[PDB]
Amino acid sequence: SHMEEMIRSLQQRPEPTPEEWDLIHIATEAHRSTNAQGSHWKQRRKFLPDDIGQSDGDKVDLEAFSEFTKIITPAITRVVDFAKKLPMFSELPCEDQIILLKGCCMEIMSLRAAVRYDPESDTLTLSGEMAVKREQLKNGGLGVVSDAIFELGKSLSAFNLDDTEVALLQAVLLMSTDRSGLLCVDKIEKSQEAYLLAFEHYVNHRKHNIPHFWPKLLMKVTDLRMIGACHASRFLHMKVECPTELFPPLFLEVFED
Ligand SMILES: CC(C)c1cc(Oc2c(Cl)cc(-n3nc(N)c(=O)[nH]c3=O)cc2Cl)n[nH]c1=O
């Protein structure tokens, strides 16, 4: 950290262009509208009871699993609905839309839960409705991914992210070419770079009193990708241990193969 304050004073921190403010407002309203309770979630959230996810070495609590899979079909649907509201997504072929959602769905869901972290109760709130402790989400299926989402939630309290920063982060996660099978690779790659640049410029506009904010927020993309990859491993475990009848059709569609 030699000459850090001057180097910081010397960086170019451009605001968003008129064309970038189009993406930002559209994305922000796509997020807000598909995060319905997002205004009033803290005021009217039901805590999942203390007996539900309580206490071999890695068996799933089916009562807790059942409570999560009851709400998950709307949760997945909120993500699909978010993607549909972005212009560069809806134009894509059907096979690409599927691949992009299969890749990012848990990444987005986890981000949304983590921004609803409450330091007071040590709880995440899921889909604006269901407040859960770490132990409950762990034993209900997620295992170590529970610990990872909570650790992300705690670390994002400092970042004071608004609806726009969350929205653009979701858009960056959605428009990744890291998945196999995509036809329209260039149109997606070009869309991501447009969101990334718009996002950096909005972060410049916000002026957080936090050193290296933008690099630090980019490290959270890696955290979310690790959540997504690790969840794929847990979903196999869930499919082995939990009865099939507890998996909704949309849940199976998004996370199999
Ligand atoms: C245990 C297992 C069945 C499981 C649980 C699980 O829990 C969550 C759920 Cl049901 C929903 C969200 N979520 N989704 C949104 N679209 C949203 O706006 N807000 C939000 O909180 C997040 C999480 Cl972590 N996710 N995947 C899983 O496989």
Curated annotation (Swiss-Prot):
Keywords: Congenital hypothyroidism, Cytoplasm, Disease variant, DNA-binding, Metal-binding, Nucleus, Receptor, Transcription, Transcription regulation, Zinc, Zinc-finger. One of its GO terms (biological process) is type I pneumocyte differentiation. Changing residue 127 to N: No effect on thyroid hormone binding. It is found in: Nucleus. Residues 19-219 form the NR LBD domain. GO terms for molecular function: chromatin DNA binding; DNA-binding transcription factor activity; DNA-binding transcription factor activity, RNA polymerase II-specific; general transcription initiation factor binding; nuclear receptor activity; protein domain specific binding; protein-containing complex binding; RNA polymerase II cis-regulatory region sequence-specific DNA binding. 3,3',5-triiodo-L-thyronine binds at residues 78, 127. Coiled coil: none annotated. GO terms for cellular component: chromatin; cytosol; nucleoplasm; nucleus; RNA polymerase II transcription regulator complex. Disulfide bonds: none annotated. It comes from the Eukaryota. Belongs to the nuclear hormone receptor family. NR1 subfamily. Binds DNA as a dimer; homodimer and heterodimer with RXRB. Interacts with NCOA3 and NCOA6 coactivators, leading to a strong increase of transcription of target genes. Probably interacts with SFPQ. Interacts with C1D. Interacts with AKAP13. Interacts with TP53INP2. Interacts with PER2. Isoform alpha-2 and isoform alpha-1 interact with TACC1, but the interaction with alpha-1 is weaker. The interaction with isoform alpha-1, but not alpha-2, is decreased in the presence of thyroid hormone T3. Composed of three domains: a modulating N-terminal domain, a DNA-binding domain and a C-terminal ligand-binding domain. It is linked to Hypothyroidism, congenital, non-goitrous, 6: A disease characterized by growth retardation, developmental retardation, skeletal dysplasia, borderline low thyroxine levels and high triiodothyronine levels. There is differential sensitivity to thyroid hormone action, with retention of hormone responsiveness in the hypothalamic pituitary axis and liver but skeletal, gastrointestinal, and myocardial resistance. This is Thyroid hormone receptor alpha. It comes from Homo sapiens. The gene is THRA.
